[PDB]
PDB file of C-alpha atoms in Angstrom:
ATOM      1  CA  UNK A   1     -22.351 -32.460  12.767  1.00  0.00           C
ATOM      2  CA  UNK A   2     -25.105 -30.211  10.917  1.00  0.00           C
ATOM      3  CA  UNK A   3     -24.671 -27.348  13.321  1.00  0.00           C
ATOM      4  CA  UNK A   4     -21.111 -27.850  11.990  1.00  0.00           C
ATOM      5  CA  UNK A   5     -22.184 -26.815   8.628  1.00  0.00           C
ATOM      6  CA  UNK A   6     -24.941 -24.309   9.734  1.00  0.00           C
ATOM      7  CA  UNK A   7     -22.331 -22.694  11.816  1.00  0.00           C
ATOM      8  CA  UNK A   8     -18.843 -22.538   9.318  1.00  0.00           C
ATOM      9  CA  UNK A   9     -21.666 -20.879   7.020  1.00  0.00           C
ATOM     10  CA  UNK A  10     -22.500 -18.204   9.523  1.00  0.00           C
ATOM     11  CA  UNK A  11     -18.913 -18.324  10.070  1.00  0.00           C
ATOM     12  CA  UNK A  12     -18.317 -17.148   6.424  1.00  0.00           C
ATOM     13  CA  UNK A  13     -21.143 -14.899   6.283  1.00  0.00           C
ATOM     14  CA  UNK A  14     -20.180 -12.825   9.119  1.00  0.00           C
ATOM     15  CA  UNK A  15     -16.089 -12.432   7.476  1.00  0.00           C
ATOM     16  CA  UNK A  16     -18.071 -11.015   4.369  1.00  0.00           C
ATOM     17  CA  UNK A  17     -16.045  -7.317   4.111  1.00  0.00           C
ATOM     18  CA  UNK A  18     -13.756  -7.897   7.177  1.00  0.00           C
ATOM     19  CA  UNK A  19     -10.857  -8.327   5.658  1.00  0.00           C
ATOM     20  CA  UNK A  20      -9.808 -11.342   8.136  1.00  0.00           C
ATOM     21  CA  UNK A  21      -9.944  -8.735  10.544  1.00  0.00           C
ATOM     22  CA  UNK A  22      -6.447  -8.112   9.704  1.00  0.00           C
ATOM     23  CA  UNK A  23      -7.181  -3.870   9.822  1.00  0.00           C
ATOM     24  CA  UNK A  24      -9.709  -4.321  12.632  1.00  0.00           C
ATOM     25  CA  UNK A  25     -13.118  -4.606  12.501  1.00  0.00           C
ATOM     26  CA  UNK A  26     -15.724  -3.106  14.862  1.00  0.00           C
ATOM     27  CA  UNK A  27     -16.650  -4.131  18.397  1.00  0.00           C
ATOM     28  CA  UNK A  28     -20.041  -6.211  17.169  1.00  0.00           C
ATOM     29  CA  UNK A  29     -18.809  -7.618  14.262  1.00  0.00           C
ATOM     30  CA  UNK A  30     -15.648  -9.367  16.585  1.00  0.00           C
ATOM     31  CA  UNK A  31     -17.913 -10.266  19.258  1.00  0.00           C
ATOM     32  CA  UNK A  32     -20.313 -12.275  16.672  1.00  0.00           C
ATOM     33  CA  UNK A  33     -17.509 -14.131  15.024  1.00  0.00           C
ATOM     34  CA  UNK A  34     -15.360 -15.043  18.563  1.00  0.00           C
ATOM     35  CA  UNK A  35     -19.350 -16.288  19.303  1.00  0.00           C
ATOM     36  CA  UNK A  36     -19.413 -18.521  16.437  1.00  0.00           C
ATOM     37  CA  UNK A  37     -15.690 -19.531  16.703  1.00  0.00           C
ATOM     38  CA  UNK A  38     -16.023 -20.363  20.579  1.00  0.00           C
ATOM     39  CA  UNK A  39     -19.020 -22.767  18.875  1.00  0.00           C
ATOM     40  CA  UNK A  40     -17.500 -24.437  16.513  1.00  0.00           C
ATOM     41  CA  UNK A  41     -14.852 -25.374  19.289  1.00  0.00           C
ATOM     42  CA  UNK A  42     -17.160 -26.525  21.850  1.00  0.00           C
ATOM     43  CA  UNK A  43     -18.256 -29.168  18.757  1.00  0.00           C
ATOM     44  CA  UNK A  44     -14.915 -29.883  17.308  1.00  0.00           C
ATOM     45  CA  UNK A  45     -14.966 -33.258  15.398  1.00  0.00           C
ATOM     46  CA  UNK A  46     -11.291 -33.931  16.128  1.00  0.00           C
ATOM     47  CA  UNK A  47     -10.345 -34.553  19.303  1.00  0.00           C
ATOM     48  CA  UNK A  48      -6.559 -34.810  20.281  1.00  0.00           C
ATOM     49  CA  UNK A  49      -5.829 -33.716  17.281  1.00  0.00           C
ATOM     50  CA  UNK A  50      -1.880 -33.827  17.471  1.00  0.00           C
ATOM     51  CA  UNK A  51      -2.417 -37.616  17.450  1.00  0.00           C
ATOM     52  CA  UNK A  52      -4.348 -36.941  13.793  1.00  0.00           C
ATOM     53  CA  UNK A  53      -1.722 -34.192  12.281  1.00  0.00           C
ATOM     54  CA  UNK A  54      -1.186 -36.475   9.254  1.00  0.00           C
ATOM     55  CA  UNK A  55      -4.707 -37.173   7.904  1.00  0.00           C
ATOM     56  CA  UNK A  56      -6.362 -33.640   9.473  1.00  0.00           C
ATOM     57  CA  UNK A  57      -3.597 -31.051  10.055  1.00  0.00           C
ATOM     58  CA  UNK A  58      -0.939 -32.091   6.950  1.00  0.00           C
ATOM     59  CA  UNK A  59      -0.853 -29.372   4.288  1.00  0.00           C
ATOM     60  CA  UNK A  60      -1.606 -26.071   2.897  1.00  0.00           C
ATOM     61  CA  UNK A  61      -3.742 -23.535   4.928  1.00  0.00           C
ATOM     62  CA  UNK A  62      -5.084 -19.852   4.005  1.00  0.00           C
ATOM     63  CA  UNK A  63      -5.985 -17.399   7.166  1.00  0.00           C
ATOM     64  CA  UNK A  64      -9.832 -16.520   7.119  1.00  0.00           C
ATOM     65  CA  UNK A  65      -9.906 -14.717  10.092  1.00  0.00           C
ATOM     66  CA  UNK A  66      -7.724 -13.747  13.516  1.00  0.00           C
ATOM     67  CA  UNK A  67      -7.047 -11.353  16.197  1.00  0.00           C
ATOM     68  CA  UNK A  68      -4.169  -9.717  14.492  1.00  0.00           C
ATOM     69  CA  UNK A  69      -4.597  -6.184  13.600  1.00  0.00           C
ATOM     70  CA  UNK A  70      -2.070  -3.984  11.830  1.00  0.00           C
ATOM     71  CA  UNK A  71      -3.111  -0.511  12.415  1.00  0.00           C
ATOM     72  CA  UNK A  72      -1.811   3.719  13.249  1.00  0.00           C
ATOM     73  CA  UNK A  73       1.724   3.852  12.687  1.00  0.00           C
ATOM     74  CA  UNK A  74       2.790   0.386  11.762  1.00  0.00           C
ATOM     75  CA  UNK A  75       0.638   0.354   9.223  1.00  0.00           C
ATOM     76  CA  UNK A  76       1.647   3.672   8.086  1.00  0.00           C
ATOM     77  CA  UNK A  77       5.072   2.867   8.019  1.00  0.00           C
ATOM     78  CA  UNK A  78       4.532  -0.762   6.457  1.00  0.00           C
ATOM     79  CA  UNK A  79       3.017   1.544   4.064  1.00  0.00           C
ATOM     80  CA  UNK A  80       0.009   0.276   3.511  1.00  0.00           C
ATOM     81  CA  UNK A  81      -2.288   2.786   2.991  1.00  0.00           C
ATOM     82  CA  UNK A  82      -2.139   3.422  -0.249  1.00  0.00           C
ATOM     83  CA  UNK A  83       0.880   1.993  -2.317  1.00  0.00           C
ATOM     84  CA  UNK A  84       1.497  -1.739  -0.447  1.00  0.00           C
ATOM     85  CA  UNK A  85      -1.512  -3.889  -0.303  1.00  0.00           C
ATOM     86  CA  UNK A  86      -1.923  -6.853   1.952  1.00  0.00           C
ATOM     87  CA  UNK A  87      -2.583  -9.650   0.854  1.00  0.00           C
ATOM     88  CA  UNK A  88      -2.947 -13.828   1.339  1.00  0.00           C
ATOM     89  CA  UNK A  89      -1.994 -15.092   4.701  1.00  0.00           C
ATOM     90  CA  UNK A  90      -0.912 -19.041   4.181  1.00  0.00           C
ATOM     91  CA  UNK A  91       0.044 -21.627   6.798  1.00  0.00           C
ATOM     92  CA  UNK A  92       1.781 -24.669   5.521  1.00  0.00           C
ATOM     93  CA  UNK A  93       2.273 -27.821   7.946  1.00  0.00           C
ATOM     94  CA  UNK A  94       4.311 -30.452   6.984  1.00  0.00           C
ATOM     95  CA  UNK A  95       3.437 -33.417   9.337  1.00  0.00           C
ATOM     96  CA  UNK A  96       6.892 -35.625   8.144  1.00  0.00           C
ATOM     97  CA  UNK A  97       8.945 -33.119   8.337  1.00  0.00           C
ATOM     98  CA  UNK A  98       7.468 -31.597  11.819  1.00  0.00           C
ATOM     99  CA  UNK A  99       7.608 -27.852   9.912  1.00  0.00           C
ATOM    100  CA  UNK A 100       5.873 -24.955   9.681  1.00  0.00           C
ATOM    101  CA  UNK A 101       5.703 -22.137   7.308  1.00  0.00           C
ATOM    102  CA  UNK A 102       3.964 -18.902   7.126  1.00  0.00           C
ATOM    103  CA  UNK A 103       4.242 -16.815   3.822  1.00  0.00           C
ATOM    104  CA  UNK A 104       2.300 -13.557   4.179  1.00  0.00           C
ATOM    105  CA  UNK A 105       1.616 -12.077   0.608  1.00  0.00           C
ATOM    106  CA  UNK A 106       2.180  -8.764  -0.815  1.00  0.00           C
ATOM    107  CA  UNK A 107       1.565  -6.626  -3.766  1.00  0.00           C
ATOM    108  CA  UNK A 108       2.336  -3.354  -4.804  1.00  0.00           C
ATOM    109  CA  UNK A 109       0.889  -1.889  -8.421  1.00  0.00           C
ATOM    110  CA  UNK A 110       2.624   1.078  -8.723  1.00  0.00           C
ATOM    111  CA  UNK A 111       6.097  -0.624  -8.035  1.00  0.00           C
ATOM    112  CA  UNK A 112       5.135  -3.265 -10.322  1.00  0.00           C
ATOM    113  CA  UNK A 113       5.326  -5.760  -7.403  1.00  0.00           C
ATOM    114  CA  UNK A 114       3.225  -7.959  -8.891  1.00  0.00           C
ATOM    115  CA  UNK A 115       3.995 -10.951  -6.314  1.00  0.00           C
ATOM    116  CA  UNK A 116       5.628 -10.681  -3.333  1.00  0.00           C
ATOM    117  CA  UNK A 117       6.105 -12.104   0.067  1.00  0.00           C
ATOM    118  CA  UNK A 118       7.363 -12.585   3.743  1.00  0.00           C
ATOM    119  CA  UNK A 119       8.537 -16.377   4.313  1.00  0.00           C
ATOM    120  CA  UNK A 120       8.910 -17.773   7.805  1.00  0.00           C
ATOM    121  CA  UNK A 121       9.946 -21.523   8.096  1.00  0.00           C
ATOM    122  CA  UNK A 122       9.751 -23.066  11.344  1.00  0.00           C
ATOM    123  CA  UNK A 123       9.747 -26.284  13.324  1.00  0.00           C
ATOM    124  CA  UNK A 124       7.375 -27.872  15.553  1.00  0.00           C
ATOM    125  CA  UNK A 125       7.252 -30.029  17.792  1.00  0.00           C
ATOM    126  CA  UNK A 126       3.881 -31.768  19.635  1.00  0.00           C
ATOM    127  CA  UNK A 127       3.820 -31.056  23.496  1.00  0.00           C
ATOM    128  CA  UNK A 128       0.279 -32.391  24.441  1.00  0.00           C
ATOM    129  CA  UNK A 129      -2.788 -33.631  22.779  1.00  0.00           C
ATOM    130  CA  UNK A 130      -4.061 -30.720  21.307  1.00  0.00           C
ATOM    131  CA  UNK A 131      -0.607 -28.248  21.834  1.00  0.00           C
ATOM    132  CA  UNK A 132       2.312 -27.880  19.451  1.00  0.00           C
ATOM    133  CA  UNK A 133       5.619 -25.566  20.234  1.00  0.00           C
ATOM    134  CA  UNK A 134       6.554 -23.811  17.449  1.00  0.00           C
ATOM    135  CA  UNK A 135      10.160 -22.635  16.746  1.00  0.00           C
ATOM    136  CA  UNK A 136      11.534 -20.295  14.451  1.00  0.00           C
ATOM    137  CA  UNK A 137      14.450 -21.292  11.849  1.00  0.00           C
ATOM    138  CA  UNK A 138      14.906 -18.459   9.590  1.00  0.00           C
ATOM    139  CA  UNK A 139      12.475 -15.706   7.281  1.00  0.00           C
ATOM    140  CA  UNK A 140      13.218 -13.801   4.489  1.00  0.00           C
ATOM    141  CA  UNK A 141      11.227 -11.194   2.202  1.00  0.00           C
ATOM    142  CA  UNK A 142      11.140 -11.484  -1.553  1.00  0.00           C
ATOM    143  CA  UNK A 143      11.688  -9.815  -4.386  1.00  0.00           C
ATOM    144  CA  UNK A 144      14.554  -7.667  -3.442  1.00  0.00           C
ATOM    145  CA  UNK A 145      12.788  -4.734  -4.785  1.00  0.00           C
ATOM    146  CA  UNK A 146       9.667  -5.523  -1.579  1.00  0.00           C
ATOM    147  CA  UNK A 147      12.970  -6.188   0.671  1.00  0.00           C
ATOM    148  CA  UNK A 148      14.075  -2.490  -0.218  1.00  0.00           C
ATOM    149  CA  UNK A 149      10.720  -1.495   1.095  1.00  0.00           C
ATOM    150  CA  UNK A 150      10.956  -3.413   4.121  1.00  0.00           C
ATOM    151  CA  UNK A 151      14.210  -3.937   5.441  1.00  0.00           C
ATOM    152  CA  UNK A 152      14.486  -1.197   8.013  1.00  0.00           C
ATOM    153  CA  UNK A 153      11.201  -1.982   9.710  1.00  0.00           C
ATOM    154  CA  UNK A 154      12.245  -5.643   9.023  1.00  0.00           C
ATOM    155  CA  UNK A 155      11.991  -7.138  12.589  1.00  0.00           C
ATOM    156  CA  UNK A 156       8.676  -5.282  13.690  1.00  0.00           C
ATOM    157  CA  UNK A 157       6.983  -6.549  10.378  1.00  0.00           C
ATOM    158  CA  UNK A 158       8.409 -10.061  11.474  1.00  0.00           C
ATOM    159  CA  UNK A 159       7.032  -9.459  14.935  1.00  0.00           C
ATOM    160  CA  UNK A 160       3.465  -9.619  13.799  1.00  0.00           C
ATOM    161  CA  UNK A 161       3.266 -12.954  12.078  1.00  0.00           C
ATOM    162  CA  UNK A 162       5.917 -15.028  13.895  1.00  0.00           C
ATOM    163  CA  UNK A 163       4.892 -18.389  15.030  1.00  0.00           C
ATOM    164  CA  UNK A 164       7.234 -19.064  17.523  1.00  0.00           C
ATOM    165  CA  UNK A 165       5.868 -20.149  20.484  1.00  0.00           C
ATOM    166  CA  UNK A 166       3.045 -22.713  20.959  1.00  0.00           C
ATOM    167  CA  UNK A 167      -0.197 -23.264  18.897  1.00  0.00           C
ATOM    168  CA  UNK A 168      -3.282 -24.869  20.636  1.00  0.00           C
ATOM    169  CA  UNK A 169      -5.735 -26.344  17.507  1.00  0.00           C
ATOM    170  CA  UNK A 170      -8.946 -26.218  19.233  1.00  0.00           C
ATOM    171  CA  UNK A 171     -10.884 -27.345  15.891  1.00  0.00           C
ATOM    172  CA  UNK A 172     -10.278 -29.106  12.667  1.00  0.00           C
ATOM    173  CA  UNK A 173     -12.606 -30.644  10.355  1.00  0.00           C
ATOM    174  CA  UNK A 174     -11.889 -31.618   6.093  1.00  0.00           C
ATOM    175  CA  UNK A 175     -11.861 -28.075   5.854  1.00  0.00           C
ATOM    176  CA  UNK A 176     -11.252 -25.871   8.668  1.00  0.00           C
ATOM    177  CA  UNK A 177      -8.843 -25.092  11.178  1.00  0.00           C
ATOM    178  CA  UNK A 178      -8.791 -23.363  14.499  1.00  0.00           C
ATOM    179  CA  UNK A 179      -5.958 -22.468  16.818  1.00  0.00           C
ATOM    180  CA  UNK A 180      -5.142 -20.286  19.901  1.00  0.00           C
ATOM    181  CA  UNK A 181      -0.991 -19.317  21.228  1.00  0.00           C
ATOM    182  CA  UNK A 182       0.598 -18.291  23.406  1.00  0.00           C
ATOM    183  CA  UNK A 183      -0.828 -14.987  23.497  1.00  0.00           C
ATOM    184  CA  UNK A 184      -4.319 -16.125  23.428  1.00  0.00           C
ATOM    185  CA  UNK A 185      -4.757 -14.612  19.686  1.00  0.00           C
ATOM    186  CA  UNK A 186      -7.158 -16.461  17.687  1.00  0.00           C
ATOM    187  CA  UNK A 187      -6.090 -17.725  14.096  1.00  0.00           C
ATOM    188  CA  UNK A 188      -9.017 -19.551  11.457  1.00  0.00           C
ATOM    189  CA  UNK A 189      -7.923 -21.140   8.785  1.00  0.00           C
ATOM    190  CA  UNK A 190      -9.377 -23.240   5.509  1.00  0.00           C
ATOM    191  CA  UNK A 191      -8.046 -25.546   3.718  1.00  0.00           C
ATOM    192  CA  UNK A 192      -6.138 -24.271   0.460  1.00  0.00           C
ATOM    193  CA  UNK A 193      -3.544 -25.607  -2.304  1.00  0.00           C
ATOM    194  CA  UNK A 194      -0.104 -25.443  -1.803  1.00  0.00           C
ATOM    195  CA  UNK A 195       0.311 -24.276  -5.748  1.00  0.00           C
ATOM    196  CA  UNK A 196      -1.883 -21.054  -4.613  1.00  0.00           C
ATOM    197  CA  UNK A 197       0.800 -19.765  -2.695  1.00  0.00           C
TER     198      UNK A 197
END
């Protein structure tokens, strides 16, 4: 429980410049932070935590770090070299309603984008003490203006932040959250408030 601090701040320290890994990150720099992740696990303070979702899991999320990478040509034709630019990743979880929601932020400057976003609502349901399946409902991009932009790569760009299939939350304390799926990605998250999305 003070290795739990010592480590979320080495945790923190090592993201410093990575970008969430979300554009990749080199060999070293992956291999420290899975290190410190794989730690934090083996000392998680919540144990079955689908029987806690309400006072530990409830609420607004913002992605620190995970195994997805957008890089070569879908990120060239997601265009986001130079004129989109990537930005928040939340997770919401709403424990009543057994939902899920992922809103992955955009931007754009030159197309006066100022605020923009892909929405994915889903369901959940719990399927063991630390599992829940996750189910897709529906997902839309906004403004239309980002949706022109978009549309014809729609489903591939959908593709890389779905949450359908099943989320294992290996660790969750008052302010962080760790999960594997279904295709053994990693996803870190910290706490954050619903008005910042």
């Amino acid at each position: 429980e003070a290795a739990l601090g010592d480590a979320k701040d080495a945790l923190y320290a090592a993201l410093e410049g990575m970008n969430r890994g979300i554009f990749g990150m080199t060999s070293e720099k992956r291999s420290e932070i899975h290190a410190l992740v794989e730690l934090l696990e083996s000392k998680n303070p919540t144990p079955e935590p689908t029987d806690k979702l309400q006072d530990k899991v409830d609420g607004c999320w913002r992605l620190v770090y995970s195994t997805i990478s957008i890089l070569g040509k879908k990120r060239t034709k997601l265009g986001l070299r130079d004129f989109i630019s990537l930005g928040d990743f939340f997770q919401m979880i709403d424990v009543k309603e057994e939902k899920a929601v992922n809103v992955i932020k955009f931007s754009a400057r030159a197309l006066k984008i100022l605020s923009g976003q892909l929405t994915i609502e889903a369901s959940y349901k719990i399927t063991t003490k630390t599992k829940v399946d996750i189910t897709l409902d529906s997902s839309t991009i906004t403004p239309d203006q980002l949706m022109n932009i978009f549309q014809k790569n729609y489903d591939m760009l959908l593709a890389i932040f779905n949450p359908e299939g099943w989320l294992e939350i290996t660790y969750v304390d008052e302010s962080l959250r760790i999960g594997r799926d279904d295709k053994a990605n990693i996803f870190v998250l910290e706490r954050a408030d619903p008005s910042e999305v």
